[PDB]
Structure formats: C-alpha cells, structure tokens
C-alpha cells in the first residue's frame, strides 16, 4: 500500500575469510600441511598459492529480518513468490557458479598467473559428498554462458537459495602465480591483513567477487560484469553508474514492482533479486 520505514535483509551467500597459504607444487592432493605466509619474507621453494574459504548458501529471498509494515511484508513475499513460481534461482545461480568457477576472488593474485585451478566441495559432514575441479584461465570470466558439468553446481545453489537443502561449499584455489613471488593480501589501517599470523582476504572482498554478476545495465554489453550494488557504483576506478534519473536502478525497480505490480517483458529482475540476496538496510522513509 506504501513502503515501510524500517526494513533490513540479511546476507545470503556469506563467505568466510579466505586464508592464503603457499606451498610447493606436486604436493597438491597431499596438501594437508602446507604452511601459510609467515610474517614478511617469501621464499622461492613454494611455487603456487592455496586460497580456501567456506561458503554457506542459506535460503529465503524476500523475507526481511526486521520489517515494519505487514501489508508490505506480505506484498513483498508474494512478489518473491511470483518471481519463484516463474523460475527457480538457477539463472542467478549459474552466474554465481561462474564466479565460483574461476578464481576471480583472487583479485590481483590471479592476473599474472599461468595455471589456476579451483576445487569446490559440497560437504554434508566432514566427509566430502561431491567434488568439482575447474580451470580458471580456461573458463569464461566474461560471457557466452557455456560450460558443461557446471549446471549441477548451478542447481545446487538454486536448491540452497530456494531452500531445498543445506548447502555448504568448501573451496580451494591453486594459483600458479610463479616460483615464489611476493603475493598481496588485504590491508588494514600500512599493514597487511592477518588472521592468526597467517595472511588472508576479507570476507567482504571475497564476497565482492561473488555478486560480480551484473552484465545487464543501461550501456551496451561490451565491458562485462559489475558488482550488484544499489546505485551501482565503482569506488576506485571512479565511474558511479546507474543514476537515479533514468529508471534502471534498485530502489526504483523494487518500489515500482512491489507497490505498482509492473510486468512487461522486464525479466531482467535478477538485479533486484540479487540485491535481496546481498541484503542490507534498504531505505527507508
């Protein structure tokens, strides 16, 4: 009937902090004990990297943690219900699986690498239930939406976002950046970011490569994907995109589709649902 004043959503697709360990190649499957970066001098024995984080795919899309109006609550839940009757989460889930497929969570530890392999493990207990292996340099990173045996990893995340099972994913990334150069972890307020005396990447930075989805935007599709952001901006390159003057924008496409029940051929609604999977204090007033 109108927008509420207090509304927040919770972070689905939450990664953990990815600890980065080095280690020499030809010990790959027997990588129980590879040491981590011990600080700030890096050897030449170790010739590849090892980046591991766990990923939980929770479930629930348009259910707020803390709403304020019950009519708006049920209208938003029936909008997400009419989205999910149309199709699963599998179109968003295959695009999340694309970012899982390469190691694009290695931000600059991937550019300048000769072979990067990513191993995703769907685990029910400590026992591993089904494993995956992908080649990061040889798979996509831009477009054309085509690689076999990745659709099962898409259907897994579609089930986990739709709630058809608990999904826990334990990923490992082996980056042959070369014979022991000095890699770059995240940096706090200059000091490198650590966890326990082991260098790592923040989970919002690991998570920022996962909602790098959005190849649909007002300009032509020649530059590729942007992270799904309200008023979708880039913070250091400088270009702050998706101006609210023109209508393709999260708050506009949310408030006109919940309150004003819009349905032309507008089936790029994946940006709005991908913002709801991101969560956050949306508005309000």
């Amino acid at each position: 009937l109108s927008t509420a004043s207090v509304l927040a959503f919770e972070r689905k697709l939450d990664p953990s902090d990815a600890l980065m360990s080095a280690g020499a190649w030809a010990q790959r499957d027997a990588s129980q004990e590879w040491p981590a970066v011990t600080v700030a001098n890096l050897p030449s024995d170790a010739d590849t990297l090892k980046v591991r984080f766990t990923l939980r795919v929770l479930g629930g899309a348009g259910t707020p943690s803390a709403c304020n109006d019950a009519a708006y609550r049920d209208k938003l839940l029936q909008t997400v219900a009419t989205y999910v009757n149309d199709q699963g989460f599998a179109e968003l889930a295959r695009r999340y699986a694309h970012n899982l497929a390469n190691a694009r969570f290695l931000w600059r530890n991937r550019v300048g690498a000769e072979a990067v392999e990513v191993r995703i493990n769907h685990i029910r207990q400590g026992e591993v239930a089904r494993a995956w292996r992908f080649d990061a340099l040889a798979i996509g990173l831009r477009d054309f939406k085509a690689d076999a045996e990745l659709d099962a990893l898409a259907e897994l995340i579609a089930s986990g976002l739709s709630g058809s099972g608990h999904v826990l994913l334990e990923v490992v990334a082996f980056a042959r950046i070369g014979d022991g150069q000095e890699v770059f972890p995240s940096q706090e307020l200059k000091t490198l970011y650590s966890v326990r005396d082991a260098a790592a990447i923040h989970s919002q930075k690991i998570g920022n490569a996962l909602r790098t989805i959005d190849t649909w935007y007002p300009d032509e599709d020649g530059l590729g994907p942007i992270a799904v952001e309200p008023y979708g901006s880039v913070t250091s390159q400088g270009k702050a995109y998706r101006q609210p003057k023109q209508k393709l924008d999260f708050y506009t496409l949310l408030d006109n589709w919940v309150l004003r029940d819009e349905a032309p051929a507008v089936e790029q609604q994946h940006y709005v649902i991908a913002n709801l999977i991101r969560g956050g204090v949306f508005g309000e007033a």
Partner: protein, 187 residues
C-alpha cells in the same frame, strides 16, 4: 610491424587509474627472467606537465615477433571472435625528435647513503668534515612513479635526457626493458 590496434575511449571496470597505471606496463611478461622471448617495446607519447600529472593513457608500441612467435601457448587469446576487424591502420611516415627514455638511473641510493662512501676494510678517523653536503638543496620529482616491494611513495629519479636515436631495440642488448631510441610518432 603494422598490426597495431587502438581501442576507443571506453571506461573499463577492471583497471583503476590510481597507483598502478604507470607501473605495470610489462611486468607480467617473462622479460625479467629472459628464458624465451626477449623482444618488448616501451614508449610514451604523452609528455604533458600541467599540474601533478605526466602520462595517463596507453599507447606503447611493442615488437613484431612477440605477438606472433611467443603466443603459441594461450596467454592473450580468448578474445578472438568478438568484433570484426575494420579498415587497417598505416604506419606513420612522419616522426619527431621527441621520445622519452628511462635506462640507466642507478648511481647513489638515498635510503643507504653514509656507508657506501668509504668502506674498503679499513678504519675511519676523519669522517665528519670530509665534504659539505649542506650546500645543495633541491626538491622536484616530475618523473613516472614506478614502484616495487618495500617502497614509500617513490624512491627517486632525475631527468638524464639526451640519449635519443631514431633506432629501435636490438636482439641480445637489453639493459632494463628498452634500448637507445625507438619508433613512436605523435599521430
């Protein structure tokens, strides 16, 4: 050779122009170990000194053998059938006497100064009034900041211009990444 392409001014959401646009130009290549190919060209057409900036867009002409012989392994491909190649460009018949360089600047480090001066495995009885260093005072750094590990803003460099020819690189003769002279014109 001729087969050089420029793209038009499009904004790229993968490359921030903040601290690495004048540093990483040929650093991901294997030219520092030199096990395979060794031909790479470094150029800078843009000399504009207005206020706190020197060089901001990419036009750097490399060699002829590097795109053709060194790329037998997949290292720059994948972007083959994106667009159709249009009308070809010409190699410019004019060129000026303009081109900038950076080769030989390593003479006297500034983080380690007092002990490079006299150590030949002997003592120091007179080491306080040897030369006056308090006479000279200069402060200017308009050069390309090119960074490494354990650096501040920038270590040093001074303009040591004057070596310039109309001759490009040669095989086997490399000092850092470039030889005496080269071919790049204005247009």
């Amino acid at each position: 050779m001729d087969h050089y392409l420029d793209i038009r001014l499009r904004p790229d959401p993968e490359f921030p122009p903040a601290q690495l646009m004048s540093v990483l130009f040929g650093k991901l290549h294997q030219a520092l170990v030199a096990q395979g190919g060794d031909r790479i060209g470094v150029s800078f057409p843009d000399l504009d000194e207005s206020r706190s900036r020197l060089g901001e867009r990419l036009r750097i002409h490399a060699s002829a053998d590097d795109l053709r012989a060194l790329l037998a392994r997949p290292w720059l491909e994948g972007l083959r059938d994106h667009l159709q190649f249009g009308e070809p460009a010409v190699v410019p018949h004019p060129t000026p006497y303009r081109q900038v360089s950076r080769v030989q600047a390593k003479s006297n480090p500034e983080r380690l100064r007092r002990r490079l001066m006299r150590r030949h495995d002997l003592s120091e009885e007179e080491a306080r009034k040897r030369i006056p260093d308090t006479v000279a005072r200069a402060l200017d750094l308009p050069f390309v900041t090119l960074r490494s590990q354990s650096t501040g803003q920038h270590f040093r460099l001074f303009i040591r211009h004057g070596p310039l020819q109309v001759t490009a690189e040669e095989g086997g003769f490399t000092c850092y990444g470039l030889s005496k002279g080269g071919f790049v014109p204005w247009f």
